[PDB]
Amino acid sequence: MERMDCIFCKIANGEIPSTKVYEDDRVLAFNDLNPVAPYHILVVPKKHYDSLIDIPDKEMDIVSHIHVVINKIAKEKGFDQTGFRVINNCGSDGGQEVKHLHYHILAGKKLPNYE
Amino acid sequence: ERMDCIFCKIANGEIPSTKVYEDDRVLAFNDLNPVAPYHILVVPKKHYDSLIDIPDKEMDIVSHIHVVINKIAKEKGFDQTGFRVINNCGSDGGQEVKHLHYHILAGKKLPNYEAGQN
Ligand SMILES: Nc1nc2c(ncn2[C@@H]2O[C@H](COP(=O)(O)O)[C@@H](O)[C@H]2O)c(=O)[nH]1
Numbered sequence: 001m002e003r004m005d006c007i008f009c010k011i012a013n014g015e016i017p018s019t020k021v022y023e024d025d026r027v028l029a030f031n032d033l034n035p036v037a038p039y040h041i042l043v044v045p046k047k048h049y050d051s052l053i054d055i056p057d058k059e060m061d062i063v064s065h066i067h068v069v070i071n072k073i074a075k076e077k078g079f080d081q082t083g084f085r086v087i088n089n090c091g092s093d094g095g096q097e098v099k100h101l102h103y104h105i106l107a108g109k110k111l112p113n114y115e
Numbered sequence: 116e117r118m119d120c121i122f123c124k125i126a127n128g129e130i131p132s133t134k135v136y137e138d139d140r141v142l143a144f145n146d147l148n149p150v151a152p153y154h155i156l157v158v159p160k161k162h163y164d165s166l167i168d169i170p171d172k173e174m175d176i177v178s179h180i181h182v183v184i185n186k187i188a189k190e191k192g193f194d195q196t197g198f199r200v201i202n203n204c205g206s207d208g209g210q211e212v213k214h215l216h217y218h219i220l221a222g223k224k225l226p227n228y229e230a231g232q233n
């Protein structure tokens with residue numbers, strides 16, 4: 001379902017404004033407020049999960065659906081052939097700040113390589 | 116399978132690696148050049164060049180990879196401390212090895228690399 005205090009529940013259900021790039025009955029994709037690349041898009045389920053590690057194994061296909069949507073967005077926006085990065089930050093060490101499952105799509109420039 | 120693919124050779128057991136997970140579909144192994152105390156690569160045994168080369172109807176391999184990630188996290192204890200999952204797709208994504216793989220980084224407070232932190 002949803003969480004009353006969750007900013008991404010409210011963005012996903014339209015109660016807080018965003019710039020939407022894709023929507024279906026299971027997910028919303030919208031531009032990040034603080035982009036780190038020319039494309040910085042968040043893909044979220046409409047159902048609230050706190051984080052990846054909180055999705056039961058039996059429910060993990062939400063992540064596959066998110067990935068079908070990521071590929072659709074990359075093709076539509078013309079960054080599939082140039083390339084892109086997909087990130088999930090889980091919990092404290094992962095750097096998660098908003099506790100509602102989200103995947104970052106970063107594209108439109110050559111991204112840094114971790115060294 | 117691809118002759119020039121390091122990960123096909125690691126997956127079919129032709130090349131040595133340090134194995135973290137294996138089932139009939141997926142292998143996970145330590146990255147040769149780790150950037151965190153846990154730096155694990157999770158790969159299908161089947162070769163796909165990249166995320167965009169997976170047909171929609173086969174995207175369940177990504178869900179299975181994520182079950183594997185969570186299983187490893189729970190075993191190792193970084194379920195509680197946190198972790199990051201990364202896929203690099205194509206040139207600008209920084210993909211080098213053109214065989215679908217996910218990076219798991221864990222075991223330390225990770226920097227926001229794409230925001231410039233190291
Ligand atoms: N569009 C939008 N993005 C937000 C809002 N609040 C936070 N963000 C973005 O949400 C992301 C949270 O990612 P995290 O660091 O939790 O992985 C950040 O990149 C941040 O800029 C908001 O109100 N609207």
Ligand SMILES: Nc1nc2c(ncn2[C@@H]2O[C@H](COP(=O)(O)O)[C@@H](O)[C@H]2O)c(=O)[nH]1
Nearest residue numbers: 121132144145146147148203209210211212
């Ligand atoms: N274990 C192992 N990792 C490798 C080998 N060759 C490359 N790698 C790792 O494969 C990763 C590829 O990530 P990419 O940058 O393509 O997303 C790199 O982090 C690199 O260290 C190898 O022979 N063995």
Ligand SMILES: [K+]
Nearest residue numbers: 051100101102
């Ligand atoms: K998340």
Ligand SMILES: [K+]
Nearest residue numbers: 165214215216
């Ligand atoms: K890949």
Ligand SMILES: [Zn+2]
Nearest residue numbers: 006009048100
């Ligand atoms: Zn929420």
Ligand SMILES: [Zn+2]
Nearest residue numbers: 120123162214
């Ligand atoms: Zn391969």
